[PDB]
Design an enzyme around this catalytic site. Structure first.
Site, PDB file in Angstrom:
ATOM      1  N   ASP A  50      20.621 -10.469 -46.913  1.00  0.00           N
ATOM      2  CA  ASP A  50      19.888  -9.728 -47.946  1.00  0.00           C
ATOM      3  C   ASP A  50      19.437  -8.387 -47.457  1.00  0.00           C
ATOM      4  O   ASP A  50      19.550  -7.411 -48.184  1.00  0.00           O
ATOM      5  CB  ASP A  50      18.651 -10.517 -48.429  1.00  0.00           C
ATOM      6  CG  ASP A  50      19.023 -11.806 -49.092  1.00  0.00           C
ATOM      7  OD1 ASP A  50      20.163 -11.884 -49.645  1.00  0.00           O
ATOM      8  OD2 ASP A  50      18.178 -12.736 -49.063  1.00  0.00           O
ATOM      9  N   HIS A  94      15.999 -16.518 -51.020  1.00  0.00           N
ATOM     10  CA  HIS A  94      17.352 -16.119 -50.621  1.00  0.00           C
ATOM     11  C   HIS A  94      18.384 -16.184 -51.755  1.00  0.00           C
ATOM     12  O   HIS A  94      19.537 -15.875 -51.537  1.00  0.00           O
ATOM     13  CB  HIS A  94      17.793 -16.902 -49.353  1.00  0.00           C
ATOM     14  CG  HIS A  94      18.987 -16.316 -48.639  1.00  0.00           C
ATOM     15  ND1 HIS A  94      19.128 -14.969 -48.385  1.00  0.00           N
ATOM     16  CD2 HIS A  94      20.110 -16.904 -48.153  1.00  0.00           C
ATOM     17  CE1 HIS A  94      20.272 -14.750 -47.757  1.00  0.00           C
ATOM     18  NE2 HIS A  94      20.893 -15.908 -47.614  1.00  0.00           N
TER      19      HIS A  94
END
EC number: 1.1.1.37
Lengths: 308, 312
Positions: free
Chosen positions: A146, A173
């Protein structure tokens, strides 16, 4: 320092094992485990690279020989694509592997890569608790992909050096739980449309890959890259290096959810400090509150999987 | 510089591409091509890595858009293993692949440096040369058979045997790229010496090191990750020399002054135009001299096989 990669024969695991073989410091040991019988040969293949990193591969049902004396355990086992059936399979795998970790190397730092991370670190935590070896400072959901996607997208949009951009990412996530703190990137500013577009692109970046792969799967090489950065940070911190800071999904103070990704100072015992998420913009504040129920469901799903 | 990888979706290609994405100089371009439809997404995958290397992936039958403006072309396409296929079957597939991909290279980027990774390198760079000649674009200084994996393997086995740091050993390897055509020049390795038994055992270990991976993989696969590491070392050395760096030396299989065979692997000074100098193999031990002379029939057969493939 010794690193174990469980799920080593997969697309993520081979990328990871390659980057670790050539990037771990001299005198490091790397062991590879997967149920796939190629695994001892993945190690042999990598063993022909002239670096001062001992490497060995292991297959079968028992991960013990890979795990003996491991300082860091990175778990990337599992498939990617019924949706209930595949989750039950990935969850089962994490539950089993972590149980092997708990028996053989309970004081290891444990990086969970296997998705869905929001849910799988909860499974991990519960397994470690039932074994009586749970240390909340040594369990991490690896969210680093990410962050590196965020850095890439910001650099391209803002015409920056991609290696000089570092975006904080908090939350979880997947999807709306992923919250890049674009208001906190030093020396760069964003329009509200840019914030909305970048945020959505970051939150949907896995789908971007899946779609371009035309059925050949999800992210493997970027994910191995991301996980390598994270494992090498843990290694560095465990060897005594100072100022090693990573965002990761951990059990913290529980202000937002039981598990939450925030900036971490890393150290000789894993987490040295859970750092403050700092000042959020109105858009970020709204994004945080809008995701909390989603993340709490992800967590509960993992707790129930173990505890019934 | 722009680098194209043809065969970018295979085990070797993905390892190569991942390494190039992080290690190419800032400002480099990276194109990936493979017939497999996954390929555009392998690139999109890699594009999420925050390095100053633009990457794009391509598929279908036409490698042209991957190839446009390419300075270096690395061809790792091909299969190490396939159900129902024997060595002879696998050869016809790989040779066909190379013949095709090189024709595409000759059309779109004939001035690129071209690195042949696809095995058997002894034969497939001869195919490549015959293709490029037919097109009228053959540059003898710009076609290389990638032999680097022999070198890094030798560095590895020697370091381990003699208690050296693996990063500190650099074994010259000459000849060709399989079996008895692979000749490590262990007589030329600093500080240390080897017993005849050691030369015999190390040389044989180096000549059969791929088998060792095949066997450990339970016959379920081949060397991919170390091959990708080897091809990246090669491709990065080529890039540095094309950008104007001096003192860049690599061993590679090239057409030279056919003192031994038309194609032969030897120390090469790399330059802005590909091969800058084909350097002397140096002084050989008795074992080495014998090994060289004894490989030559094989090496020449390997080469003639390549020309036969193209020119029916």
């Amino acid at each position: 320092m010794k690193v174990a990669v469980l799920g080593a024969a997969g697309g993520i695991g081979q990328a990871l094992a390659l980057l670790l073989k050539t990037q771990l410091p001299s005198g490091s040991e790397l062991s590879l485990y997967d149920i796939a019988p190629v695994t001892p040969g993945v190690a042999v293949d990598l063993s022909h690279i002239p670096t001062a990193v001992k490497i060995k591969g292991f297959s079968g049902e028992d991960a013990t020989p890979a795990l003996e004396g491991a300082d860091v355990v990175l778990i990337s086992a599992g498939v990617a694509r019924d949706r209930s059936d595949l989750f039950n399979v990935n969850a089962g795998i994490v539950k089993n592997l972590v149980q092997q970790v708990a028996k053989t190397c309970p004081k290891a730092c444990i990086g969970i890569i296997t998705n869905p991370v929001n849910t799988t670190v909860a499974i991990a935590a519960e397994v470690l608790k039932k074994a009586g070896v749970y240390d909340k400072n040594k369990l991490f959901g690896v969210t680093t992909l990410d962050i590196i996607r965020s850095n890439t997208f910001v650099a391209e949009l803002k015409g920056k050096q991609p290696g000089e951009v570092e975006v904080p990412v908090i939350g979880g996530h997947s999807g709306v739980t992923i919250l890049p703190l674009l208001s906190q990137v030093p020396g760069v500013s964003f329009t509200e449309q840019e914030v909305a577009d970048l945020t959505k692109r970051i939150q949907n970046a896995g789908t971007e890959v899946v779609e371009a792969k035309a059925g050949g799967g999800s992210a493997t090489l970027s994910m191995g890259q991301a996980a390598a950065r994270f494992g090498l940070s843990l290694v560095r911190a465990l060897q005594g290096e100072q100022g090693v800071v990573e965002c990761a999904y951990v059990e913290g103070d529980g202000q937002y959810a039981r598990f939450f990704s925030q900036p971490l100072l890393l150290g000789k015992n894993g987490v040295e400090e859970r750092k403050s998420i700092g000042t959020l913009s109105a858009f970020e504040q709204n994004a945080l509150e809008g995701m909390l129920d989603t993340l709490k469901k992800d967590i509960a799903l993992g707790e129930e999987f173990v505890n019934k």
